[PDB]
Design a protein around this motif. Structure first.
Motif, PDB file in Angstrom:
ATOM      1  N   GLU A  39      -8.287  -1.786   8.987  1.00 40.49           N
ATOM      2  CA  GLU A  39      -8.467  -2.081   7.567  1.00 40.49           C
ATOM      3  C   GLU A  39      -7.995  -3.479   7.188  1.00 40.49           C
ATOM      4  OE1 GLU A  39      -6.357   0.797   5.300  1.00 40.49           O
ATOM      5  OE2 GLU A  39      -4.365   0.168   5.954  1.00 40.49           O
TER       6      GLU A  39
ATOM      7  N   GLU B  25       0.823  -1.203   0.000  1.00 38.08           N
ATOM      8  CA  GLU B  25       0.000   0.000   0.000  1.00 38.08           C
ATOM      9  C   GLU B  25       0.860   1.257   0.000  1.00 38.08           C
ATOM     10  OE1 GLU B  25      -2.213   0.316   3.591  1.00 38.08           O
ATOM     11  OE2 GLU B  25      -3.518   1.940   2.914  1.00 38.08           O
TER      12      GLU B  25
ATOM     13  N   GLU C  11      -6.223   2.769   9.605  1.00 41.12           N
ATOM     14  CA  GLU C  11      -5.032   1.947   9.431  1.00 41.12           C
ATOM     15  C   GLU C  11      -5.005   0.773  10.397  1.00 41.12           C
ATOM     16  OE1 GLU C  11      -3.739   2.662   6.648  1.00 41.12           O
ATOM     17  OE2 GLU C  11      -2.129   4.143   6.847  1.00 41.12           O
TER      18      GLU C  11
HETATM   19 MN   LIG Z   1      -4.615   1.969   4.793  1.00 40.78          MN
END
Ligand SMILES: [Mn+2]
Ligand SMILES: [Mn+2]
Ligand SMILES: [Mn+2]
Ligand SMILES: [Mn+2]
Ligand SMILES: [Mn+2]
Ligand SMILES: [Mn+2]
Ligand SMILES: [Mn+2]
Ligand SMILES: [Mn+2]
Lengths: 136, 135, 135, 136
Positions: free
Chosen positions: B100, B9, B97
């Motif tokens: 997720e 990511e 964060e």
């Molecule tokens: Mn994220």
DNA sequence: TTTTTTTCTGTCACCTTATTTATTAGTAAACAGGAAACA
DNA sequence: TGTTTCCTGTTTACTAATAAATAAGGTGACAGAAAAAA
């Protein structure tokens, strides 16, 4: 790290369900070898969360009861939240156990606004189901 | 898996934003020592997510980009959901964060339907605040 | 601008090849000391051909991309010209990098017509070879 | 290198055009200040190409006149080449002086073969001139 | 009157050396168990 | 079923080393003046 809270959650649930806090049944429920449970319970007894004796079962202290009640509130809220949204049953339990530790209390507070929105009315739930099906 | 998805990511986001991903940028974006970043790039190269050139750089392969796009989509979707529900601004990035990586894509999709249920109509976003205010 | 066009040319080629341009790779490409590469990068950053980040890297702007895309076409066309005409492959690269920066674009445009005149038929190249094999 | 060959080339051209070459003629031909010409004549006296006197003039040796004619051949060949493929007449000279110093002699020989290829048959020029306008 | 050399002196082009930062490679050591043991 | 005693990899920093990128200085060919010699 998250692994610290679930023992309190489980001890609370167990003494309310069957009044028998023990080293055995909280081991397989977490799918872990009971030696890890043996180490963790002795670690957190020293933080005033427990009452213990060398040949007797555990009991919660005055602060442990209310901490566990908050934990059970959080878990029970999130399960029905996910059911309202409409994720299939096979997913829900481990999704909840995955997210329940990383959400701050502001998010758990504001999710209460959202769960009531679909439970005190009959129509909004059906609109949400209509959208859910319109692109399934 | 979560710990590798974080690196995919962040690498994708840096490439998208400024065209190059450096070890010293990924280290700050993740708040880790750069030795961990290099030891993890040399671990993503053998799974073929990356092309890694020592002391030169790294690039995403076609396998990596397909994943990174989905990860960034999940990030934005969950942020937008929390923003629609009204979470405190400073807390949204910390919560998203966190949660997720534990969420099944099934519930991600159903959240994607939930977000548009409210994005569809201006009336609903304050009908919900009518529930909020009576607390 | 001979000395300046080479940097944009090589940076474009190197981004298309590697995905990223590094100072040391540019120094090897142009066969110069890397400090001369830094000094020229900081100048192309003020002519607005590229975006420069200290100890981080380069990105071509919309000007630089469209300039380099043309320079690379010029390079390929001249290589194809000298290869059609019958030059031995050793010297083609040196001749191309020598002349390409002094030719006008009218010359390039007409060399393109010559190359097409020879690529549209097979007998023409063999008549050319038959004149080479006796003069 | 350019500035090393072009003085021999221009001195030869002036000597054949007028029978003598002044320093001012070379300064105008290369568009430089005449002291730059004299300080280069010093560099060529050291290398046997020509004979020099402090205030009288320059004369090419048997070494110089052999090389100068080959350089004039290169110049005329490249000019005729660029004029065959259709470059605008005003563009030719500046393009020749640019490339004549960087083309190796192999390329020059192959360019001579190419010039022959078009100069030996008129129809090839008409084919090329048709394609030259087909897509303007 | 007009070239044609001798010095002045400026930018500049490019590399060498040194310096500041970024990247990579071991060492360590606290963690999280966990296979045997008991009772 | 209620624990104990050594094993046994995992995860991350930390400290070194290694290279890469940047800045401060030199040389030294090449112009461009401006006097001087002819
Ligand atoms: Mn994220
Ligand atoms: Mn839990
Ligand atoms: Mn729970
Ligand atoms: Mn992530
Ligand atoms: Mn070039
Ligand atoms: Mn080229
Ligand atoms: Mn020339
Ligand atoms: Mn010439």
């Amino acid at each position: 790290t998250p692994s610290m809270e679930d023992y309190i959650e489980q001890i609370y649930m167990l003494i309310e369900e069957k009044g028998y806090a023990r080293v055995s049944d909280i081991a397989e429920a977490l799918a872990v070898h009971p030696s890890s449970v043996t180490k963790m319970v002795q670690k957190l007894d020293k933080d005033e969360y427990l009452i213990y004796e060398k040949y007797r079962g555990l009991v919660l202290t005055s602060k442990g009861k209310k901490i566990g009640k908050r934990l059970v509130y959080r878990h029970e809220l999130l399960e029905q939240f996910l059911r309202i949204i409409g994720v299939d049953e096979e997913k829900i339990y481990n999704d909840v156990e995955g997210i329940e530790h990383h959400l701050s209390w502001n998010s758990i507070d504001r999710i209460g606004d959202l769960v009531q929105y679909f439970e005190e009315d009959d129509a909004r739930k059906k609109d949400l189901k209509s959208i859910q099906k319109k692109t399934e």
